[PDB]
């Protein structure tokens, strides 16, 4: 799941 991967980074600073 890349949507998981970049969405998580998107809500980390």
């Amino acid at each position: 799941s890349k949507r998981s991967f970049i969405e998580d980074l998107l809500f980390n600073k």
Partner: antibody
Amino acid sequence: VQLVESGGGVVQPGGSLRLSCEASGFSFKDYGMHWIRQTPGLEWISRISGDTRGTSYVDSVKGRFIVSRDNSRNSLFLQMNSLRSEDTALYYCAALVIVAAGDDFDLWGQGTVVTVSS
Amino acid sequence: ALTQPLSVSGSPGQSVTISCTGSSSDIGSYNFVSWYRQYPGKAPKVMIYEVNKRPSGVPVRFSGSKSGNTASLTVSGLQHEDEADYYCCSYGGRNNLIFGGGTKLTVLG
């Protein structure tokens, strides 16, 4: 494919509610989940990652609300403590496509009304 | 924190556009703009996301675009089933989501 909410109602200022979102039809553990409340418009409140590791809050609810999920039961929660009048709204849970990365899944529950009133 | 006009209208078959104004650190900085349609007594459904992308199932007349700090939803060839409230959404700039205030699209009859 469905998200089924409950846990709202009439609560007194300072009170506590625990909102529930129950997920069926899809791989729950693989989606960020949010809480969005609606008043006259929509206001984003909170987000939890699929793997539960990371949470966000809008500032007005920081300290007072806590998002949590239970992937083993496809459940999303919003423990609301220390409620204020300003918290009165229709609260949605939702999986939102903000970055699709090939996956345009987007799903909201039916809402649950929270009214903060003595 | 995302501004939409209060309401917009048009007749069956016309084209209407709904603007959505943010700041530079949000709409101006990411391509994470989505739109949601909401019918009376129902939950929002996504019409557009990533500024101009449409999920299959959403009619081809729905299109999204972005210029500077302002996103837009256009609805070509209007239909009565398109009457609803439409909310824009953007990534907010710091681990964050912001929504617009809503716009009431009336298909006049």
